[PDB]
Structure 1
Amino acid sequence: DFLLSVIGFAVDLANVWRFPYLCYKNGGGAFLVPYLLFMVIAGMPLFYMELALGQFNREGAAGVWKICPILKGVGFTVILISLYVGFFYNVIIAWALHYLFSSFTTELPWIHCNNSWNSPNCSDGTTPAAEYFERGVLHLHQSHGIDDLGPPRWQLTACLVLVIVLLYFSLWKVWITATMPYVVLTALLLRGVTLPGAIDGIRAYLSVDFYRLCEASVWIDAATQVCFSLGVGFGVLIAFSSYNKFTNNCYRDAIVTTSINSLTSFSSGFVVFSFLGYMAQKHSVPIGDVAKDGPGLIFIIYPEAIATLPLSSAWAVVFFIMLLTLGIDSAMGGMESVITGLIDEFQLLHRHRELFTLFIVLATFLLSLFCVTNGGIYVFTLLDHFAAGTSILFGVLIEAIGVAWFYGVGQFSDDIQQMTGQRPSLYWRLCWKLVSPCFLLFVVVVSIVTFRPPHYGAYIFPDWANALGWVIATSSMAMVPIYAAYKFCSLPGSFREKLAYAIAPEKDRELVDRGEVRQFTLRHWLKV
Structure 2
Amino acid sequence: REHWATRLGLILAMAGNAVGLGNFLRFPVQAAENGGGAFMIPYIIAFLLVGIPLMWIEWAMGRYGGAQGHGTTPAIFYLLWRNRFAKILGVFGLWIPLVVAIYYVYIESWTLGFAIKFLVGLVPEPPPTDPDSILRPFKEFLYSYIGVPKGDEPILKPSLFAYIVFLITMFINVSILIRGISKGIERFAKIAMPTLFILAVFLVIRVFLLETPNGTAADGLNFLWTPDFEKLKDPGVWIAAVGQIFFTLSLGFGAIITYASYVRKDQDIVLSGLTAATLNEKAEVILGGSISIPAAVAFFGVANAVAIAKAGAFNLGFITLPAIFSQTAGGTFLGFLWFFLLFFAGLTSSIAIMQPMIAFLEDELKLSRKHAVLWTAAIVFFSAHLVMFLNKSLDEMDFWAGTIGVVFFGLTELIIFFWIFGADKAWEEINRGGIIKVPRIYYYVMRYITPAFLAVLLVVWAREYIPKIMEETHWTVWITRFYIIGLFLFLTFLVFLAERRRNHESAGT
Q: What TM-score range do you get, normalising by the shorter chain?
A: 0.7 to 0.9
Superposition pairs of residues 39-438 of structure 1, within 5 angstroms: 39-57=47-65, 58=67, 59-62=70-73, 63-64=75-76, 65-70=78-83, 71-105=86-120, 109-112=123-126, 123-124=132-133, 127-134=136-143, 136-146=144-154, 149=155, 153-172=159-178, 174-196=189-211, 197-198=215-216, 199-267=218-286, 268-280=288-300, 286-290=304-308, 293-296=311-314, 297-347=316-366, 350-351=367-368, 353-373=369-389, 376=391, 378-416=392-430, 418-420=432-434, 424-438=438-452
Give the deviation of 1:208 after TM superposition.
Answer: 4.4
Contact 2:249 2:280 in 1 (8 A): yes
Query: Which amino acid is 1:391 matched to?
Result: G
Unaligned runs of 5+ in 2: 1-8, 180-188, 495-509
The Cα shift of 1:42 comes to 1.2
Amino acid at match of 2:60: A
Q: CA deviation at 1:86?
A: 0.8
Q: Using the alignment, how far apart are the partners of 1:285 and 1:402 within structure 2? A: 45
Change in Cα spacing, 1:122 to 1:28, as seen in structure 2 (3 Å) is closer
Q: CA–CA distance in 2 between the matches of 1:402 and 1:54?
A: 14
Provide Cα deviations, 1:227-280, integer angstroms capped at 9, x if missing partner.
Answer: 111112122222222222333221111221121111111121222221012111
The verdict on how the C-alpha distance between 1:76 and 1:414 changes in structure 2, with shifts beyond 3 A counting, is: same
What CA distance in whole angstroms lies between the structure 2 residues aligned with 1:481 and 1:86?
A: 18
Shift of 1:355: 4.0
- Call closer, same or farther: CA 1:302–1:12 in 2, change over 3 Å: same
Residues of 1 paired with 2:134 and 2:116: CA distance? 28
The 2-side partners of 1:474 and 1:395 are apart by 16
Give identity over the alignment, percent: 21
> Counterpart of 1:110 in 2: which secondary structure?
coil
Moved more, 437-446 or 386-395: 386-395
2:255 and 2:356 in contact (8 A); partners too: yes
- Against the structure 1 CA distance between its residues 387 and 143, is the aligned structure 2 distance closer, same or farther, given a 3 Å change threshold? farther
* Residue pair 2:16, 2:193 contacting (<8 A) in 1 also: yes
Q: 1:38 to 1:446 in 2, by over 3 A?
A: same
Determine which of 23, 29, 32 is the counterpart of 1:24: 32
- For residues 433 and 59 of structure 2, the distance between their equivalents in structure 1, rounded to whole angstroms, comes to 12
More helix by share: 2
SS in 1 for 2:325: coil
In structure 1, what residue type is equivalent to 2:453? F
Q: Max radius of gyration: which structure? A: 1
Distance 1:415 1:317, change over 3 A: closer
User: Deviation at 1:380?
Assistant: 2.0
Instruction: Determine the structure 1 residue equivalent to 2:498.
Output: none
The alpha-carbon distance between structure 1 residues 310 and 152, as it changes in their structure 2 partners (threshold 3 A), is closer
Instruction: Go from structure 1 to structure 2 and tell me whether the alpha carbon gap of 1:424 and 1:150 turns closer, same or farther (over 3 Å shift).
Output: closer
Question: Does structure 1 conserve the Cα–Cα contact (< 8 Å) formed by 2:50 and 2:450?
Answer: yes
CA distance, structure 1, for counterparts of residue 134 and residue 80 of structure 2: 61
Q: 1:176 to 1:123 in 2, by over 3 A?
A: same
Contact 1:13 1:323 in 2 (8 A): yes
Letter aligned with residue 363 of structure 1: I
Query: 1:331: how far off?
Result: 0.8
Q: Note if contact 2:174-2:377 (Cα within 8 Å) is conserved in structure 1.
A: yes
Q: CA deviation at 1:95?
A: 1.0
Quote the Cα distance in structure 1 between the aligned partners of 2:397 and 2:23.
Answer: 19
TM-score, normalization by structure 2 = 0.82
CA distance in 2, matches of 1:261, 1:285: 28
Match of 1:464 in 2: 475
Aligned AA (2:441): Y
Deviation digits for residues 153-178 of structure 1, max 9, x if unmatched?
32211001111122223333512112
Verify: 1:450 aligned to 2:464, yes or no: yes
CA contact under 8 A between 1:79 and 1:235: conserved in structure 2?
A: yes
Is the CA contact 2:22–2:247 (under 8 Å) kept in the aligned structure 1? Answer: yes
**In the TM superposition, what whole-angstrom CA distance separates every residue of 1:182-201 from its partner, at most 9, and x where no partner exists?**
11111111122232222322
Q: Deviations over 1:410-438 (max 9, x none)?
A: 22233455545876442121111101110
Aligned-pair RMSD on alpha carbons? 3.3
In the alignment, is residue 34 of structure 1 matched against residue 42 of structure 2?
yes
Query: Structure 1 residues 332 and 311 mapped into 2: Cα distance closer, same or farther (>3 Å)?
Result: same
Letter in 1 for 2:428: D
Distance 2:272 2:351 in 1: 21
Deviation at 1:150, TM superposition (A): 5.3
Structure 1 pair 126–474 and aligned structure 2 pair: CA distance change class (3 A): same
CA deviation vs aligned residue, 1:1-51 (integer Å, no higher than 9, x gap)? 321211121111111110011112222122111111111111101111111
Contact 1:275/1:301 (<8 A) preserved? no
CA 189–415 in structure 1, closer or farther in 2 if over 3 Å, else same: closer
SS of equivalent to 1:123: helix
Q: 1:320 to 1:398 in 2, by over 3 A?
A: same
Give the TM-score normalised by the residue count of structure 1.
Answer: 0.79
- Say whether the 8 Å CA contact 2:108–2:346 is kept in structure 1: yes
Between the aligned partners of 1:150 and 1:29, the Cα distance in structure 2 is 36
Contact 1:171-1:332 at 8 Å conserved across structures:
yes
Give the residue type in structure 2 aligned to 1:369: H
